[PDB]
Scaffold this active site. Structure first.
Site, PDB file in Angstrom:
ATOM      1  N   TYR A 159       0.791  -1.247   0.000  1.00 16.69           N
ATOM      2  CA  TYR A 159       0.000   0.000   0.000  1.00 16.69           C
ATOM      3  C   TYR A 159       0.816   1.287   0.000  1.00 16.69           C
ATOM      4  CZ  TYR A 159      -4.709  -1.916   0.527  1.00 16.69           C
ATOM      5  OH  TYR A 159      -5.920  -2.535   0.305  1.00 16.69           O
ATOM      6  N   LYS A 229       1.854 -14.147   5.695  1.00 13.32           N
ATOM      7  CA  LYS A 229       2.272 -15.169   4.744  1.00 13.32           C
ATOM      8  C   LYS A 229       3.797 -15.278   4.810  1.00 13.32           C
ATOM      9  CE  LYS A 229       1.616 -18.317   1.592  1.00 13.32           C
ATOM     10  NZ  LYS A 229       0.713 -19.509   1.528  1.00 13.32           N
ATOM     11  N   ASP A 282      -3.422 -17.814   4.114  1.00  6.94           N
ATOM     12  CA  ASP A 282      -4.359 -18.579   3.294  1.00  6.94           C
ATOM     13  C   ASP A 282      -5.149 -19.544   4.187  1.00  6.94           C
ATOM     14  OD1 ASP A 282      -1.958 -20.001   3.674  1.00  6.94           O
ATOM     15  OD2 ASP A 282      -2.008 -20.949   1.714  1.00  6.94           O
ATOM     16  N   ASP A 306      -6.968  -5.931   4.653  1.00  4.60           N
ATOM     17  CA  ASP A 306      -7.989  -5.561   3.675  1.00  4.60           C
ATOM     18  C   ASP A 306      -8.842  -6.781   3.349  1.00  4.60           C
ATOM     19  OD1 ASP A 306      -9.241  -3.817   1.665  1.00  4.60           O
ATOM     20  OD2 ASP A 306      -8.197  -5.022   0.176  1.00  4.60           O
TER      21      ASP A 306
HETATM   22 MG    MG Z   1     -11.124  -3.132   1.259  1.00  6.06          MG
HETATM   23 MG    MG Z   2      -1.813 -22.077  -0.131  1.00  5.96          MG
END
Ligand code: MG
Ligand code: MG
Lengths: 415, 415
Positions: A159, A229, A282, A306
């Site tokens: 961002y 992640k 994830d 987000d």
């Molecule tokens: Mg959003």
């Molecule tokens: Mg994955």
């Protein structure tokens, strides 16, 4: 020449020792918002005024002051004045403000106005609580199990808006530097290639995670989950996770659970052991559906936040009533979290629930918890009564269809 | 000295004019996988062999050849041989292979072995179909409405693994270049700051989107949705979207729907008008829950594809049975999509459904559609019969609990 009018009656909120000093008659800047902002904002003003009046028996009253950003700003101040300098000045000066949804134009190289406000005011916390309101039509079987609070880092990550267009001189310059000076070999196609930069800092991470833990303590929550992640992005997402755990250890006396990696932080007020843990992003999008009860306060980077806030809002049937705050050390800006929905603008039709709950968060932030509690109560009652706007009603049997303004009235009626 | 044994009976698959030439006795490399790979892989081998035998009446037979990657590779080939060069050579040489879940070590600076395989073999398509199997316990009210196919770009994005550790000489060098040479001002905290690079190319984008559209045509699907966060990342995610639409126009005769931006592409075989559209990624995570029927083929970048495939799998109750392929122009590697779950390894307990459906995809890829159809039928019957492994059974009433091996038998029984 400014077109903002400072209310004759009203005092500015001040800040001392990290604590807001809120007078009985605070001036609160508000941005109407574009599109359906014209519908939801007046509903919000009425509802907040009623809650304040009922809670403090007329001893307190907000002096609302309209300020400008977005499409309305261009109409007030002129062509290409999408975000006036005075709006930044005023929000900082008056400490607490609220806004409807904003239109960011396309074709003029203007980046998200929401993001611009967050970054220029250094509102590094995007605070998004997601809970279920009984009676809300939901696409999942057990939305009542979802009661989470998102601390989304608001100042860094991809961002930052550092990027260059494919085939531009700048992009090629960056790519040449990476390949020839950094010895980078893993760009699959170096030609016609756009490039973005993802920063994550220790200070950025820790100020966000510090706020998340303090919130867990203040509100007696059960756990803080670092979502990241980090297995793929070791030095940004993975560093976010490491610094978050480190912060819990160094500042909050975090102790190891079992053989780790989870930590426990003792709530100094209640004695409760707050769990500090982490989930890969994830997997987390799966776990919020499959085991929502195991999650509470969430701390994550900008882009993940987000996605997580949207996914959680959808699952509790709260796409259109999700509150949000952008909080920094010097001021705070509460916001409608949905879009401008221009097709319905001015039809008194859409759900004012989001900006109203953001206003609830605003009142709570001001220490006016009684008024905030009245809004939550009114929202619970109205929804439970199935007296709701079309976006809820179309998904239900036996509901009473209300206009936007009427739904605001129902909230007041249920306080 | 290689420890791989080439089967005496068996011929290698070849590739001519972009078409696989599959003999009746193809040699197929397989990687057992670590942890529960020891349970699910033999179930897969038995089920595939049964489907092949039943479909082609013994005229065809796979000659399975074990190859190595992951924890097993270290035990076969020695310390730190996590991914032998021969495994890359063999997969490329034999064109079609399958693997169980892989253990990637921590503490030795080794990046994801799954990602390494995808990148080194240039398997630029991560193909993940997500549909509902009737009888599967799901956390959502209408999982049957979900029938989507994910084309996740597998070779670029922040997965390139270009990044430098905070406070390292390299990171500071990069940050100095950005600030002093690129005039970058939007890094909030330049000290103690990790940096990652996000590339997205025209060729990378178009080869992925081209495959997605060709799949939609070949399988008579209704739409292709480009999912991206292009409003914030203009020159990577936004470029992905632009190039995707451009590709539809220039190569597939895409025509404008209404005033745009959606396009229609005429299926040259069926006459069906395939819709090409796009959704912002955070909204998309909402729309898959709220309006799943409006979505079909999905094309997106690497990280978004990671998140989307997990979210979709969770919602249909398919966390443990989600198939996946990694496909390139010269070879293809089908994979169990879950983790290694070491606590259950060797207990014949976990669900072999994922690797089995990946094997279904494998057979289909080989043009052995009859055998693939038998696996789908057997999986549908077994699940519908509520004769299932513990991960399903614990969420249901009146199910019959099966071991991993027994569930494989049930699949065969339902063919
Ligand atoms: Mg959003
Ligand atoms: Mg994955």
């Amino acid at each position: 020449e400014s077109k903002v009018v400072v209310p004759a009656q009203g005092k500015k909120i001040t800040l001392q020792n990290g604590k807001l000093n809120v007078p009985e008659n605070p001036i609160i800047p508000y941005i109407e918002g574009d599109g359906i902002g014209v519908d939801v904002t007046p509903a919000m003003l009425k509802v907040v005024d009623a809650a304040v009046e009922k809670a403090y028996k007329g001893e307190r009253k907000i002096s609302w002051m309209e300020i400008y950003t977005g499409e309305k700003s261009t109409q007030v101040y002129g062509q290409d004045v999408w975000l006036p300098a005075e709006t930044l000045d005023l929000i900082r000066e008056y400490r607490v403000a609220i806004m409807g949804p904003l239109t960011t134009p396309v074709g003029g190289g203007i980046r998200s106005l929401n993001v611009a406000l967050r970054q220029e005011l250094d509102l590094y916390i995007c605070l998004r609580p997601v809970r279920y309101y009984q009676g809300t039509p939901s696409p999942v079987k057990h939305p009542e199990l979802t009661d989470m609070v998102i601390f989304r880092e608001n100042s860094e990550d991809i961002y930052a808006g550092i990027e260059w267009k494919a085939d531009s001189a700048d992009a090629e310059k960056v790519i040449k530097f990476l390949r020839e000076e950094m010895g980078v070999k893993k760009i699959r196609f170096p030609e016609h290639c756009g490039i973005g930069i993802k920063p994550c800092s220790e200070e950025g991470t820790k100020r966000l995670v510090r706020a998340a833990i303090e919130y867990a303590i203040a509100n007696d929550r059960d756990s803080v989950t670092l979502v990241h992640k980090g297995n793929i992005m070791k030095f940004t997402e993975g560093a976010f996770k490491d610094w978050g755990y480190q912060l819990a250890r160094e500042e909050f006396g975090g102790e190891l659970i079992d053989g780790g990696p989870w930590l426990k932080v003792k709530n100094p007020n209640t004695g409760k052991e707050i769990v500090i843990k982490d989930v890969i992003a994830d997997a987390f999008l799966q776990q919020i559906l499959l085991r929502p009860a195991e999650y509470d306060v969430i701390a994550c980077m900008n882009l993940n936040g987000d996605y997580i806030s949207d996914a959680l809002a959808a699952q509790v049937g709260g796409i259109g009533i999700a509150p949000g705050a952008n909080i920094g050390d010097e001021c705070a800006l509460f916001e409608a979290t949905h879009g401008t929905a221009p097709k319905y603008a001015g039809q008194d039709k859409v759900n004012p629930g989001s900006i109203i709950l953001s206003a609830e968060m605003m009142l709570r932030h001001m220490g006016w918890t009684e008024a905030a509690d009245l809004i939550v109560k009114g929202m619970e009652g109205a929804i439970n009564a199935k007296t709701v706007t079309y976006d809820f009603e179309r998904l239900m049997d036996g509901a009473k269809l209300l206009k936007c303004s009427e739904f605001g009235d129902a909230i007041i009626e249920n306080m």
